[PDB]
Design a binder for these strands. Structure first.
Ligand SMILES: [Mg+2]
Ligand SMILES: [Mg+2]
Ligand SMILES: [Mg+2]
Ligand SMILES: [Mg+2]
Ligand SMILES: [Mg+2]
Ligand SMILES: [Mg+2]
Ligand SMILES: [Mg+2]
Ligand SMILES: [Mg+2]
Ligand SMILES: [Mg+2]
Ligand SMILES: [Mg+2]
Ligand SMILES: [Mg+2]
Ligand SMILES: [Mg+2]
Ligand SMILES: [Mg+2]
Ligand SMILES: [Mg+2]
Ligand SMILES: [Mg+2]
Ligand SMILES: [Mg+2]
Ligand SMILES: [Mg+2]
Ligand SMILES: [Mg+2]
Ligand SMILES: [Mg+2]
Ligand SMILES: [Mg+2]
Ligand SMILES: [Mg+2]
Ligand SMILES: [Mg+2]
Ligand SMILES: [Mg+2]
Ligand SMILES: [Mg+2]
Ligand SMILES: [Mg+2]
Ligand SMILES: [Mg+2]
Lengths: 150, 141, 83, 129
RNA sequence: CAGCCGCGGUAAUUCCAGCUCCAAUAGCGUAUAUUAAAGUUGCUGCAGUUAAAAAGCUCGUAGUUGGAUCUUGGGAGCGGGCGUCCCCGCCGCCUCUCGGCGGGGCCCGAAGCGUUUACUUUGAAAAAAUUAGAGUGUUCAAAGCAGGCCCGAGCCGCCUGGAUACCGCAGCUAGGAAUAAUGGAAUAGGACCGCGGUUCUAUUUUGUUGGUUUUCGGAACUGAGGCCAUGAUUAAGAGGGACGGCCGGGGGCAUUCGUAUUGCGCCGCUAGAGGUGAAAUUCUUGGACCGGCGCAAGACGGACCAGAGCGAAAGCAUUUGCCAAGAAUGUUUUCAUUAAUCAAGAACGAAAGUCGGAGGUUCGAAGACGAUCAGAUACCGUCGUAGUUCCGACCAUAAACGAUGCCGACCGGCGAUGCGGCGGCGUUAUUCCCAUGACCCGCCGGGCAGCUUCCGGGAAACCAAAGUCUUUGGGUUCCGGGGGGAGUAUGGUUGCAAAGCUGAAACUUAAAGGAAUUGACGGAAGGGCACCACCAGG
RNA sequence: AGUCGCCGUGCCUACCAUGGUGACCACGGGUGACGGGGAAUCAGGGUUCGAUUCCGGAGAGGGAGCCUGAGAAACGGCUA
């Protein structure tokens, strides 16, 4: 596997077969959506939201206690960010490397790694653009988009 | 490996086309180079005129003289060498005798122990040299 | 080797396999309940927690993460009795 | 990648049975296999099979009684036209007695004999003997 | 003479002739195209470690190929050897908004006629002659469509025939719905005499009349409501991203350290020192080589260094600090098929080499000398230019080799090693008992390799992949077709030049080649042997 | 929008617009190229030929233009 690399790892998770709720948790979904909303004000991704609940409150899967996903929940309220998480971080990482590269213009591994990254991006947007999340004319320009990130 | 899809036909049909030219016989035939360079215009036999009579030497392990002739054609004008198969038969040929020649049997390739001959004489003066040998006829003096 | 049963493997045998490569998948983690002697609360935590939990009083810390399972503060007892 | 779910299983049936095993496990556990296995079992070439369920592709187990020589697959799924059976079946099979080419068709999954007794053709999947 | 191998050099099974025999037979040889043989152009159906052959590595558009999943039974009318396995209608849905077999029936063309196809089965419609083929004793046959009967011959006539099939692909018509693709309700929508209402309003009624709303239909538009179990398939031992602790001669910039070498200064004692198979060229009382204390400059990073690690490959080794990336593991986090391979095109690419600056210890193509030699414009020795070093741009080749494309599954064991995670007797640890390695003992993942075997293959050598291949089909890319001419000539293209990429033909030739075997040979190695060998001697 | 044409059409003329084809191979060039029904070989799949008695097309020394006629740019009709 590893679309742009030679590895063949299999490190990943394994949900159980019992989808039920384990009856020691005495916490209700209405209270869950509240805590989600709080954690969404302070600017946290869906994944950061899920790990916290699992670590410190006793929630494995929102989809079982609730019936919906985290992203659908926010978008019912109107708090989902403009861009998606995946595309966001790739754009962040690129901007750092190029900045690093503006000075140390004799590092070819970085160039090579850069071209890999941008290739990963143009694929991903072709999904979101077909799937009708991004407009038909959104594009990554590589001279802007330092400003989208931060 | 091999392509092997259900809608791959253009590729395969193409691949066989450009890759067939790497066969010697097909390439020879379907290009005009061997054809326009053959003294016979895609033909079996041909008449022509004698202008010399020479003797060609043979290959190493044999040793002999094979009694050939320099011959000019009527239609094309080109020049060639030709062989006279039988014992004592060169004497049956005079100068400027209007002979008929043919191939030998290998389709452009040289045969045997003769260095560079691929034509044999058949008829001199229209009286079928083989018959003349056997004494079934004589020449038209 | 020429004859076995795969439907009914030994429990010790299916236990010593990778999560997926078992006959059926199975998770390898648990939740547990902590005591915090300086308190009288019982907060519950995941094994491979990859976070730092502060107490209810914001007085103390319980788990510092690691590449695998977490740790405890060497004075804090856990009850691995869930379900 | 595993662009085909049926190709791999029959290979992993064939190899094991070619060795001398008594049971095997084949993973992805899809619908079309189940029909394919049912019709083999029905004619008698194998025993029973138990199909494990999970909330995924699933899994499955078979019992062999290895009186089988080869199990085969033909891909791409060609299109038969009911006059070409003879030309397919003479140059895939060992004889005119036994061996079955299995094909999907509008009526279902069946062997070639039943297709001719119902007078319909379809698309080809594989073969066994 | 001889298509090929080959025959003829005074006893020719092969030439010139005679007897004899062989094959086809009113026909038989010869030349040239063209089919089969050719599984030597390979869809069915080749090959690619060493025989000819996988681009140096990576990305990437068109192309080709793509995971799992949504009505199954049990029955019913039946026919064979309560029943049981194989046979035949059904448990295609209604459509009445309508057609016509003031209101009641039971059915059809329409209205979905089938969300849209592909698929398969049927039917239509295909110019004849030709082909397969039915009938007919043309004197048989090839052909051809004719022919046969009772009978004084009367019967002024009778029977007859002039079949059938195939006709790829597109196009037409009707049935079946597995397989493959697509569509539908997510900033809500289907249905309800639905209910209000703002409009046009065609003839139904106002008998015929003059005009309006009028109940009428169907238009655009706007308002409030009850109803649906009210609407989102799961989350791949497919993938992307997040998070945590680590890992490593991975990459760039600056920085400190080391012995050695070469030169220079000063001190000390003394005639040789170098280098060779042996010599000389050369350095040498104007003090060499040796020893001693200092200084300078530029290169290189020993032993530790391993069938150990990292990187796409090229390739990577002193200390420290900084900068930005990454694999594997762990995960009851997240998105939900987003993917594999890839013409065109794009990045990187040892050494040599080219261009412009700085620098120049050591080594050293050219070049000059001294030796060996029949000769040496070489092997040896002494000197010594370009270059070897750094900064910035060109070129794009190698035995760039695992001489072995990438992805994915399956297929036998054993003991180790390196990273991460999980555990357990015990020893140390340290400073009083814990979490760090270290070992001790196992496990699990994905790695560089290794030993063993009738797994199985293969021309063999050999190989857990070069296997699962005449029992031939997992997906896809590039490339080969007797040997030379030849990676040549020419045309186009890049480049400062050198060169690179694409890439012929005439002609020539019957063998070139691969793996293994028996000899012979060897200025290759290990044991022995001889006065037609030696040593010592006559 | 019109002219010519037995009729539809950039077939032609004027005024406007700037479009049409292409790696699913246009464009250009070669053909010992008239096309098809068919012929040879043929396990199954294919390879090659088809000027040649049937259907359709083109031409009458090379080029162009016409009269008559229902019908011809005729050629055993005319004019250069
Ligand atoms: Mg890829
Ligand atoms: Mg041939
Ligand atoms: Mg054949
Ligand atoms: Mg071959
Ligand atoms: Mg050949
Ligand atoms: Mg075959
Ligand atoms: Mg080779
Ligand atoms: Mg599928
Ligand atoms: Mg390329
Ligand atoms: Mg270099
Ligand atoms: Mg250089
Ligand atoms: Mg320079
Ligand atoms: Mg020197
Ligand atoms: Mg090369
Ligand atoms: Mg190579
Ligand atoms: Mg091989
Ligand atoms: Mg094959
Ligand atoms: Mg060749
Ligand atoms: Mg070789
Ligand atoms: Mg012609
Ligand atoms: Mg013709
Ligand atoms: Mg004419
Ligand atoms: Mg003439
Ligand atoms: Mg004329
Ligand atoms: Mg005429
Ligand atoms: Mg005439």
């Amino acid at each position: 596997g590893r679309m742009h690399a030679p590895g063949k790892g299999l490190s990943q998770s394994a949900l159980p077969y019992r989808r039920s709720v384990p009856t020691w948790l005495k916490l209700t979904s209405d209270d869950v959506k509240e805590q989600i909303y709080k954690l969404a004000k302070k600017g946290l991704t869906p994944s950061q939201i899920g790990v916290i609940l699992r670590d410190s409150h006793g929630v494995a899967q929102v989809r079982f206690v609730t019936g919906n996903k985290i992203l659908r929940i926010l978008k019912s309220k109107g708090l989902a960010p403009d861009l998606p998480e995946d595309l966001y971080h790739l754009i962040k990482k690129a901007v750092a490397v190029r900045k690093h590269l503006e000075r140390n213009r004799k590092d070819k591994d970085a160039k090579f790694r850069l071209i890999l990254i941008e290739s990963r991006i143009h694929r991903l947007a072709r999904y979101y653009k077909t799937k009708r999340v991004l407009p038909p004319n959104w594009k990554y320009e590589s001279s802007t988009a330092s400003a989208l990130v931060a | 490996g091999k392509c092997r899809g259900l809608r791959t036909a253009r590729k395969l049909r193409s691949h066989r086309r450009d890759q067939k030219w790497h066969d010697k016989q097909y390439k020879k035939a379907h290009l005009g180079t061997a054809l326009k360079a053959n003294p016979f215009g895609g033909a079996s036999h041909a008449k022509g005129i004698v202008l010399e009579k020479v003797g060609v030497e043979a290959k190493q392990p044999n040793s002999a003289i094979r009694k050939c002739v320099r011959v000019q054609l009527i239609k094309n004008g080109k020049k060639i060498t030709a062989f006279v198969p039988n014992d004592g038969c060169l004497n049956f040929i005079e100068e400027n005798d209007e002979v008929l020649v043919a191939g030998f049997g290998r389709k452009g390739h040289a045969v045997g122990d003769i260095p560079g001959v691929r034509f044999k004489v058949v008829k001199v003066a229209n009286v079928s040299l083989l018959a003349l040998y056997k004494g079934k006829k004589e020449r038209p003096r | 080797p020429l004859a076995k049963d795969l439907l009914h493997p030994s429990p010790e045998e299916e236990k010593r396999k990778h999560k997926k490569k078992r006959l059926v998948q199975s998770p390898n983690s648990y939740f547990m309940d902590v005591k915090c002697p300086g308190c009288y609360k019982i907060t519950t935590v995941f094994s491979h927690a990859q976070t730092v939990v502060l107490c209810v009083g914001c007085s103390t810390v319980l788990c510092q993460p690691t590449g695998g399972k977490a740790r405890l503060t060497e004075g804090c007892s856990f009850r691995r009795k869930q379900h | 990648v595993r662009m085909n779910v049926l190709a791999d299983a029959l290979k992993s049936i064939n190899n094991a049975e070619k060795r001398g095993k008594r049971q095997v496990l084949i993973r992805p556990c899809s619908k079309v296999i189940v029909r394919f296995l049912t019709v083999m079992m029905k004619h008698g070439y194998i025993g029973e099979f138990e199909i494990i369920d999970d909330h995924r592709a699933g899994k499955i187990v078979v019992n062999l009684t290895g009186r089988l020589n080869k199990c085969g697959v033909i891909s791409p799924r060609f299109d038969v036209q009911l006059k070409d059976l003879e030309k397919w079946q003479n140059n895939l099979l060992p004889s005119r007695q036994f061996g079955f080419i299995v094909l999907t068709t509008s009526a279902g999954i069946m062997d070639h004999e039943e297709a001719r007794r119902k007078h319909t053709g379809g698309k080809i999947l594989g073969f066994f003997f």
